Write a protein that binds this ligand. Structure first.
Ligand SMILES: [Cl-]
Ligand SMILES: [Cl-]
Ligand SMILES: [K+]
Ligand code: NA
Ligand code: NA
Lengths: 251, 250, 251, 251, 251, 250
C-alpha cells in the first residue's frame, strides 16, 4: 500500500504512469511547477515526491538521490505504484571537446561502470533507453533550440576515481580506471554521470521505459568557466526539455 | 592501398561512406540491384562486395559472413576505405511469442554474447546502434509496409548453444546458457542474432555509425530450425527495408 | 575551499578528524544532538552536515544517502577536509534466525555486492573495517546493554533484487542473486545493508579508518518489508552506540 | 534430414566420419581433389562442402569461414550428420622469430581470445586438440619434411585489435590487447589465428576429435616478403599434410 | 576413522577444539613443546600433527604446508574431528617500508590472490578473520612486547609472480601482477603471505573461527629473498605469540 | 647460491635438466631408487629433493606437496637451477565410468580450477603439457601394459568442494562447483587432480616442458572397492612409467 522508502501510495499518484526523476530533491518542486497543479506528496531521505498534471494527465516527479542504488529504489517503488515510464533529467559535464556548455545530451547507451545494473541483468546486457523515450527526448531537446548530442554516457558508481579525478584525498585511481577517461573519450563517450547505467539496465530488463537527458554545464576538456547566466539557462532548459519529452510520451 | 580481405581499394568504392552489410554473400547482389548502377567489385571468402548508387550517392554492399569475427574484418577494412555508416541486414530468431515470422526487428541494443565486441570495448560498454541509423531503419520498415519491432537483441557467438538450442549433436547447453532464452525473454529481449553485438560495439566505440535490422525467419516459441518456405519472402522484405533505410541515411 | 557536494569547508569542521555517517539525513541532527554544541553546517541533496563536540573534540555528522555512490562522495570530501575516521550507523535486515529485530551488528567484513568498492580496489581486496573502530563499536554496543553481533555483512547495490526480495514489480531476481540469501545465510552472513562494502573498501585502501554498526529493523527469515513499529527505538539505540564508539576512538 | 546452414544430408556424406575444415570455401575443391572421387555437395554462405574418398573411406571437406561462430555451425551440423573427427587446415602468421615461413604449426592448445568457446565450456576449460589428431598432424607434418612446431596458438575473435594490429582505421587497441602480442610471444605462443579456440573447446567438450595444422606464410617479426613460389609451396604442403593426417586418423 | 590426509583420529586429538596451523612441518614440534605434554601424532606429506595441552585443554598443532590447497585440506579434516578454531602462524614479507623483520603482523583481512578461497565463497566475500581470534592475536602479540601491525594481507597463490618477485627464471610477471606490489603498498596492505585468503574465507564461510599472525622475515621494499640469519628468531617470537593467542581463545 | 625453499644449489643437481615431481615427499626416494646412484639432496617443508642418474644423465626427483602454490615454488626454484623439463607423477581418482582402477591417465589439458595458474597466464591460456612429454608419457604408460587414457583433467585448488564432495564438515559446496562434476563428466573430463593446471600453465608459458601422468586408484562412479594388490600395483606402475617417460625425454 505505502512503499517503504518513498512514503507514497498509488492513490497519491492519481493514475500517473510517468515519472520525471531528477537526482536532487531540491529540483523536484521546480520541475513539478512547470506543469499544472503541482502537489507535494512526500519527502523522506533523498526522495522528494511531487505530483503534477501535464495536458490533463498526472505526472510524478521524484528525486532519486545520487547513484544507482538510491535510484533503483525510487524506480522500483514507483513501478509498484503503477509508474511505467521514467524520464531521467539533470545536468552533466561533457568529456568531448566538441560538446559545448548549453548543449543537450540524450543517452543512447550507458557504459556500465556501476554495480546496481548487475542486480537486474548481467554485464553483457545493454544499458539502453527505451526507443520511444530517447526519441521523445531528442525531439524535445532539439525543439528547445539547443545543440543535441545522441550518444553513449559513462555511468560511474563514483564521482571521483570512476571519472578518473586525481584532485582527491589519495590523489590516485585504481588500476581499472587509470587512463579510463582518455579511453572513453577515444570511444566517443560524451559524458560521465552516476545513475544512467542502473536506470537504463533496470528498466530495459523489467518492462519499464526509461531514458536520460542532460544539459551540459561544464566540459572537462575546456578550461573556460561557464558564467552563472549560462548555467541557469542550461538548468532551466534541461527541465523544460524533460517536461516536453514527457508530453510527447503521454497518450 | 588494397585491404587484405575485401580485396578492394578506396577508388573502387567511388566515394561511398555508407555500407549495407548482409551476412549472406548471396544477398549482396540482391541488395545492390535494388539500387542504381550496381557493380561487382570483389568476392573473396565470405566477402562479396558490390558497389551501387542511391539517389546519386555511392553505396557499398558487402557480406560479412556469419559471426562477429568475419564481420569485424569487413567493417574495419571498409572503414579504412572511408565507410562511416554500416547497415546490417540479417536474419533473426524471435524469442517473444507475439513476433511473427516475416516481421522486422531493429536492434536498439545488443546483449553481448559474443567475443569480438570485447576486442573493441570492455563488456561494460553498450552495444548500441547509431540513433539516426536505428531511426532510419524503423521509418524504412514502417514505410515498406513491414511490421517492425524496436528492442534489445541477444547477439550470440554461436547459433546453437548460445541461443539455447537443444536439437543438437550433444543436446547439451553449457551452464552459462542454460535457461538463458527464458531469461532474455523475461527481460524483454526480442530476438537472437549473431553479429549485432560485435558490429554495434565496434562502431559505437570507433566513431562509426551502425545499426541492425533483421527479418524474423523463425519464432523460438515454436521451433529451433527456421522453416524454408518463408525465407526468401522475409529476406526480400528486409532488403527493401535496409535500402530505404540507407536512402534515409544519405 | 568548499567541497563540491557537501558544501562545507575545513574551517567549518573545527579540526574534526572523525565523522559519524548515517544514511538518513533526518538522523544527522539526532546524532549531533547526543553530543555537545551541535551546529547545522549545510544541507545539499542527501548530504546534511552537522558539527558537534565530543569530550572537547570536534566531530562531524554527515548523511551519506542510500548506496555506495553517494557514500563515496561524502567520505572523499570529508577526507579532503581532514576527516580520517568514519563511523557508519544505519539500518539493516538480519538474515540469521538467531538475530532479533533491535539487535546491533558490527560488521567485521562486507560481501561486496556493490560497484563503488571496485572503484577503489579490485574485488580480491577485503571490505574490512579498521580494527580499532570495530573494537570500539563492539565495546560501545555492549556497554549500551544491547545484544551485539560481530560478523560479515552482505552489502548490496540494491534494496530489492540484490537482497533477493521477490515482492516486487517484476517479481523476478536476476540469475546471479537467485538463491543468494540462502547462500549468505549458509556462509554465516549476518545481515543485508547497502553501504558497508563501499565504505569499508574505500577507507581500508585509502588510509582511512572505517566501521559499520547497524540496527536490525527486520529479520528476512520473516518478511521483506520492515515493520514501521520499533523502527524508532532501534534507531535510538544505534546512534547511542555510535556516539560512544566515536568517544572511544577519540580517547 | 538436411542441416540448415550447410544444406547437406547424412546421405550426401556417404558414411564419412572425418571432415577436413579449411576456412576458405575456395580451398575446399583443392583439398577434395587431393583425394579420390571428389564430389561437390553444396555451397551456401561461407560453407562449401565436398566429399572425397581416402583409402576407400569417405572424407568430408567443408569450409568454415573466418571465425569461431561460423566454424561452430559447420562443426555442429557436420556432427549431426555423423562426423566425429575435424581436421582444421589453413595457413597462419607466426609471432615467434624462430618460426619460419614454410614451417608447420600443430596446435597443442589455444589461448581462448574468442567468444564461441565459452558457449561450450567455461574459460577454465582448455582449448586442447584430441591427442590422436595432434599426433597424426605432427606425423604428417614432419613426414612432409617441413620444420614442425608443436605449441600454443593464440585464437582471436578479431584480425586487427585482437592480434594487436595498430595499422587500422582508429589505430587503437583496447586496454585488454595493448602489449598482448609481446605477452604471448614471451609465453611462447607460436601464432595468431581465429578459429582454433572455438573448434578445440567445442570438440573437446562434446566428444569430438579435433586438431589444427597450419602452414606459416608470414611472420609478424619478420620484414621479408616470401616469394610467390614459397607461398604456393606452403599452401600446397599444408593441405597435403592435413590429408595425410586424415589418412593416419582413418581406421 | 582416520582422516584421509592428516592420518589422525578424533581420539588422537584428545578433545582439542583449537588448532595451531603453521605452514612449516618443522615448526609443529616447536609450537607443541611450548605447551604441556607435547606428543607426536602423525606425519604424512606436508602434514605433521602434534598434540599438546594448554591450561589443561588439548591443543592440536598441524602443519598446512605452503598454499591454500594443502591448507584447505588440513582445515577441513581437522574440522571433521571437532576443531573449530584455527590459528595460523606463518612467515611473511613486509610490503610497507617501516614494517621491519621480526615484527608481527595480525591479518584483519586478506586480498584474495588465491584460488582455493573461491571454492568456499565467491570473490565478493571478505577474507576476514574471526573477531575473537584477531583480538586474541593482537593482545598476545602486544602483551609479548613484539612490534605488532594490524591490517590487510595480500595472500597469493604463488611466492614469485603473485608477490611480484622478478629475480626468477623468466624474470617475467604476468600483466595482472605487474606493479601490484606498489598498488598494495599504496592501499596500505601490510604484507605478503600465501594461506590467509584461503584460510580466512574458508572458515568465515564455514562457521569456523580463524586468524593469521605472521612473523616478518623480509622487507620487500629492499629485496626478494629472506635473509636466513633472522629466520629462527622471528619464528620463535611468532610461535610464542600464537600459543599465547591460543590461551586467550581457550575458556 | 641455494634456492630459498628447496635448499639446494645448481651444483647439487649435477647438471640435471629434467625433474620428476611427485606430490608426496615419501615417494621421492621410491622414484629415485628406480634410477642409478640416487642421492638425498635436501628436505625442507613438503620439498624432499633427490638426485639420481638415468642412462648416464642427472635427473632430479623433487616433491611438490599438494596444490599449485607449493608446486609453483618447486618448479620455479628448480628452473632457476637449470631444470627445464618437469614430469608430474601421482595417483588420481577418475570421474569417467570407462576409466578403471589400474589405468593410466596422461593429461592433454587441464581445467584450471586453481588460482596459481593465473599468476603465470590469464585464464584464456591453455593448461597444456609439452607435446613431447605427453607423448613420452603415453608411450611409457603403454609399454607398462596398463590401459592408457589421454584426456582433460579437472585441476582443483581444493580436495573437497572443488571436486564436488559433500561428505564434509559443512556438507556444503559453493554455487560455482554445484553440479560441476557432472559438467566435467559430460565434457569428457577424465579425473580430478590438484596440481596440473598450475604446473602446465606455468611451464607452457615459461619455456619449460611439463606433463602429468597418474595411475587411477579410485573411480567416483564405481561402487566397487579396489583391493590392496591392485592399488599397490598401480602406484608402483605410475612411478615406473614416469621414470621410463623421463628416459624417453632424455
Ligand atoms: Cl534463429
Ligand atoms: Cl616473503
Ligand atoms: K602444499
Ligand atoms: Na544516494
Ligand atoms: Na564467418
Amino acid at each position: 500500500k505505502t512503499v517503504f522508502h518513498l512514503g507514497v501510495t498509488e492513490a497519491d499518484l492519481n493514475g500517473a504512469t510517468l515519472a520525471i526523476i531528477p537526482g536532487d530533491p531540491a529540483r523536484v518542486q521546480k520541475i513539478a511547477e512547470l506543469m499544472d497543479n503541482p502537489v507535494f506528496l512526500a519527502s523522506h531521505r533523498e526522495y522528494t515526491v511531487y505530483r503534477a498534471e501535464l495536458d490533463g494527465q498526472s505526472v510524478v516527479v521524484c528525486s532519486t538521490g545520487i547513484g544507482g542504488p538510491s535510484t533503483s529504489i525510487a524506480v522500483e517503488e514507483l513501478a509498484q505504484l503503477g509508474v511505467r515510464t521514467f524520464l531521467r533529467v539533470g545536468t552533466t559535464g561533457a568529456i568531448q571537446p566538441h560538446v559545448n556548455v548549453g548543449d543537450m545530451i540524450v543517452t543512447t547507451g550507458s557504459v556500465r561502470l556501476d554495480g546496481a545494473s548487475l542486480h537486474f541483468a548481467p554485464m553483457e546486457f545493454p544499458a539502453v533507453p527505451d526507443f520511444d523515450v530517447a526519441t521523445a527526448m531528442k525531439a524535445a531537446a532539439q525543439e528547445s533550440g539547443a545543440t543535441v548530442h545522441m550518444g553513449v554516457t559513462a555511468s560511474s558508481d563514483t564521482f571521483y576515481p570512476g571519472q578518473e579525478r586525481y584532485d582527491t584525498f589519495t590523489g590516485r585511481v585504481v588500476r581499472r580506471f587509470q587512463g579510463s577517461m582518455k579511453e572513453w573519450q577515444d570511444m566517443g563517450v560524451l559524458n560521465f554521470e552516476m545513475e544512467s547505467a542502473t536506470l537504463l539496465t533496470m528498466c530495459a530488463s523489467s518492462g519499464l521505459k526509461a531514458g536520460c537527458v542532460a544539459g551540459v554545464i561544464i566540459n572537462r576538456t575546456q578550461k573556460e568557466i561557464p558564467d552563472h547566466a549560462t548555467l541557469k539557462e542550461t538548468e532551466a532548459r534541461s527541465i523544460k526539455v524533460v517536461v516536453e519529452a514527457a508530453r510527447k510520451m503521454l497518450k
